Every structure is written in structure tokens, then in C-alpha cells.
Design a protein around this ligand. Sequence first.
Ligand SMILES: Nc1ncnc2c1ncn2[C@@H]1O[C@H](COP(=O)(O)OP(=O)(O)O)[C@@H](O)[C@H]1O
Ligand SMILES: [Mg+2]
Length: 478
Amino acid sequence: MNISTIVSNLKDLILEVRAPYDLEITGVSNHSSKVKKGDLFICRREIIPEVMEKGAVAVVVEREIDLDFPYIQVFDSRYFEAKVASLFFEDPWKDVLTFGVTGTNGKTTTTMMIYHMLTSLGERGSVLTTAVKRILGNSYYDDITTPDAITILSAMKENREGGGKFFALEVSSHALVQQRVEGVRFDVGIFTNISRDHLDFHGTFENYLKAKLHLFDLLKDDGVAVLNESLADAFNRKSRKITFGTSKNADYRLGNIEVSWEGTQFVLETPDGLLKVFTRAIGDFNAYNAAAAIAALHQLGYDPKDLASSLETFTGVEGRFEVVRGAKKIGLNVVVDFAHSPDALEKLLKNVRKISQGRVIVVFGAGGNSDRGKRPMMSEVASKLADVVILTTDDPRGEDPEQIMEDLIKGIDKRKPYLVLFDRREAIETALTIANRGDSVVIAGRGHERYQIIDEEKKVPFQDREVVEEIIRDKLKG
Ligand SMILES: Nc1ncnc2c1ncn2[C@@H]1O[C@H](COP(=O)(O)OP(=O)(O)O)[C@@H](O)[C@H]1O
Ligand SMILES: [Mg+2]
């Protein structure tokens, strides 16, 4: 990539070029920590001198630099980033069936199903969500809540070069703001749901919604919008719509949801046929995720029946309704989830409620340095929908843990039996003991998380699911 190529292709973003038509560019980077030699560095709104010695050929910037150094000055750094990136990796999206999945809820599950449902129906590609990155064959499991434009596009160019014709990507409501995914074009576009409350919230609801529709700008004029029925009319653009839902007039229409410890069983009316679907993952919410997929997928002449038979193998996402099926070995069934909203909490308990023929006991705490006030109402939820509530320490990052517990304690209905134990290890041990023949013990807050973060920097090992299994191995022992 010449600078001549950049300027040429992307001229209108660029305000002023003070740089040789020459400076071949070898890579792109956003953090100083990460600069290679020859890369172009993009300075987001002192460091300039630093990043140049580290080996930077030139630097993008939003205001006048005034330094001896080769620099493209742009109208909007962050946008520019996306766009450049798309070039330097050479638009990896044209060659690969790309999927973007946004919504308030169900991003990860829906994306992961797509992923699973393609590999499983034979095929090779790549997924990239919050919870699971699989870069080609590799499941490079690691640090992916802080990806930018370059990291995503990077990872789509491994996919294509390594010969996969599809990339399944979760489009965070966050990420549409960054503009992380602005240099992309998607072949399909799933929009799962939208909350009218004050979950996932920026402005009013219209600002909240509009920003989530933007995805469909970023959509190939070839490809399709896969929409929730309840958002039918909101679709302000002019492209292919496929609806799903329960209304009798949605393109794909899902029916008799039947959640049980074997999983969600539902019945989906495709607009050419009709079929049983069984996912193994538990939760009624899992039917609008499944439906959204069998739609998007089958909107490319994949035989439905066969797609539907895919979902059978899908056993949820690690840390999301993870049943410790290995607990029946005692006398109990145990659920690990990650719920850190009043909301996910409620959904969970209702589902364990439906599915559980017995008492439901809930171990949870709250994370340091999220909302301080959404805390006592998290307890409020659990105080209602659960027979016994065991309150334990979570990841009190910065926060002093006993100054979290106070905040949580207010929402507990003091009339019902609640129990407070500040050591997660003992909370869990206890709940297993006080719970009976065939009760359900649910542990929330953490999920697949691998350490408990007490100190900003000082953290001990604690895998929620595993400690459970540990205590069970120990009880059975004697
Ligand atoms: N279609 C849906 N409608 C309502 N709630 C959902 C849906 N899909 C998932 N959820 C719930 O929302 C929470 C987060 O969903 P998740 O699959 O993690 O998407 P995200 O990655 O956007 O959080 C989960 O605890 C789950 O119970
Ligand atoms: Mg998420």
C-alpha cells in the first residue's frame, strides 16, 4: 500500500496530506504499545514523537500536528481508521459470507448458533463475539471486549486467506459507536430484539433504536435484513426484510416453546414449510435466537430440515445456563450463569422456575464499578423469584466489598429467608448443603470467568463451574 493508494481510494475523508506519495505502508495500529516498524499510527483524541521512534512510517491526526513527521490529517480519526483498515487488508468481506448480529439481547447466542450451524452442516469459517473468538481453526480464546476496527478486519483476513467463506460477528451496541465495524459490508444482518426500558441505554429510545438500525446501512445491496417482527415498521431503509416472531404475519413464525432440562423445544413455521426444532440449550429466549438463525441461514437455500437438525447438537454457550449435569450425582441440579443485570437475573430464575420441579436457591453478588444503584434492585428481583437467597462476594474490583454488600442488602425482602456469606467458596458450599432432594441451586454473577478480581491488581483463581464440581467430588468421596 502506497500512500498514493490511500489518498486515491479514500480521498474525501482526508483533509490534508503532508506526506510522500511514496511511503509504502506495512501495517496499521491504534495503540502505541502495538506499533510495528512501517505501520501507520492513528492518533485518537507528545505521543507522536514516541510512536515514531518505535518504528512508525506516518501518523493520522484530527488537528494540526506541527512536527517534522509524515502525517495525514483527517476529518474523523476513528472513522478513517475503519475505512483504511478495510483497504490495507483488502476488503476481506467480499469473498466471505459475513454476518452481523445486533440487538439488545441474544447477540452472542444467535451468532454462536449460526457458527455452530454452519460448521455442523459442513463448512469452515470463523466467529468473533464477546465470549468466544474462533479465528479460523484456532479458538484463540482471549482478550476480546476491547477490539477496534483493525483487530476485527485483521481477523477477517485470516479467515479469507485461510479459506473460509463466512465470518460470524457480534455487533455490540457499543461497537456501532466506536464505528468499529464501519469499513465492513455484511451479507446478512440480524437484529434480534430491542429493550424499551433503561437496559443498554444511551439517549431516549429513538436515539437508542436509530443507532441500532445503522447496521443495515453497512449491509451489501446484495444481502438481507433479518428482523424481529415487533420492529417491522421501524425499518427506515429499503432492502430485503425477513421477519421472525410469533405474530401470524411474520416471515418465520415460532410456536410451542417447551423448555425443560433437555432444552428448548419449539415449532417454527418457515414460509415454505414447517418443522420441529429442538435446541439443547435451555431458555424460551433461545427460540427467537434459533428462529433468527434458521431464517438468516435458510435465506440462502440451505435445506431447513437439515439446518433444524443442526440445532440439536448445540448445547448453549459456556457460562450461559451451563447445567452442572454432573451434580445429579449428589441429589441436586445446579446452574451456572453470568447474570449481572436485574434483567438477566429475572429471565434466568423464571426459566429455572419453569424447568424446576422443586425449590430454587440463588447464590450471587455484584461486580465492583458497574451501576451502584441497579444493585439493590438486583436483590429485589432474586428476593421475589427465589426460595432462598445466598449473598456472596463477587469481583469487588476497586470497590471495598462490604460497601457493595450494603448496597445489595437493601433490595432483599428481609421477611423471606436470606443468608449472607462473604466468601464465595463457602456461599457455594453452603447452598449445596441446605438444598434438598432435587432442589435447584443457581450461581450467578460470574459465568466462565477464570479469576476472581479482588484487587485492581491482585487476583486468585476461581472458576465458578469448577469449584462446584470440586465440592461435589469431595461430598461423594464420603
Ligand atoms: N432473544 C432474546 N430476547 C430476550 N432476552 C435474551 C434473548 N437472547 C438472550 N437473552 C438474554 O439476555 C442475556 C444476554 O444475552 P446474550 O446472548 O449474552 O447477548 P449479549 O451478548 O448481547 O448479552 C442472557 O442472560 C439471556 O438470558
Ligand atoms: Mg454480550
